[PDB]
């Protein structure tokens, strides 16, 4: 995250770390056995660390849970980004507390000008790299469909908005990526794409999590 502040421990109870040896990307908890992350974040070898906030450092409240199986969006396409969303079904079920919750889904899309909570441990440098230890967050609001079309010609799709700040200064970076966009209590992005970060008039684009609730739901019932 680039120009946010720092969460407070434990203040996003949702967000988790994936971990291979080493953070690599954001996730949320949507169950107790379930996080929702972005499909470029696909590898083997996941665990799952909930109730993060120092991810070098065990601070007492986390949770390690390696996944059991991961599961791609079946139109994920890793070229255009499209579809950019995966689950993650952990080996055994999260305790859920004050600290380690999940996030609901929406019920309906979220529009241009909601105020959103972006958080992450990714970078922190727009031009220089510098990888905080605790969560970083970032409120930013929706951006307008043709503002995003306009910020990033021939490559936005129905399942993709922007969020942000078209003057630049503060955004998502790289190791945000699968990490949450919450509005008003519910899930309605994960971190995608952009082109490079806080950069003017190139906002971050995230995946529509809205458009992928039926799949969510459906997925988690039958595995
Ligand atoms: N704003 C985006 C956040 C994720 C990244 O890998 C590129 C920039
Ligand atoms: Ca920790």
């Known amino acids: 995250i680039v120009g946010g502040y720092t969460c407070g421990a434990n203040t996003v109870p949702y967000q988790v770390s994936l971990n291979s040896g080493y953070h690599f990307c954001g996730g949320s908890l949507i169950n107790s056995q379930w ?32 996944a059991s199986k991961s ?10 980004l499209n579809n950019d969303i995966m689950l993650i079904k952990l080996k055994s079920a999260a305790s859920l507390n004050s600290r380690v919750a999940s996030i609901s889904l929406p019920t309906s899309c979220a529009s241009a000008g909601t105020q959103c909570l972006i958080s992450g441990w990714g970078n922190t440098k727009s031009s220089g790299t510098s990888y905080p230890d605790v969560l970083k967050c970032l409120k930013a609001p929706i951006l307008s469909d043709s503002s995003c079309k306009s910020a990033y010609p021939g490559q936005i799709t129905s399942n993709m908005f922007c969020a942000g700040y078209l003057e630049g200064g503060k955004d ?11 509005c008003s209590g519910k899930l309605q ?20 999590v809205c458009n992928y609730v039926s799949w969510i739901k459906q997925t988690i019932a039958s595995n």
């Open 71 to 80: 599961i791609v969006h079946p139109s994920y396409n890793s070229n255009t």
């Open 172 to 182: 998502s970076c790289q190791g945000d990526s699968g990490g949450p966009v919450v």
């Open 189 to 208: 992005g994960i971190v995608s794409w952009g082109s490079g970060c806080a950069q003017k008039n190139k906002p971050g684009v995230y995946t529509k």
């Open 35 to 66: 996080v929702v992350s972005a499909a470029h974040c696909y590898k083997s070898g996941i665990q799952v660390r909930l109730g993060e906030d120092n991810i070098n450092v065990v601070e007492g409240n986390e949770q390690f849970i390696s």
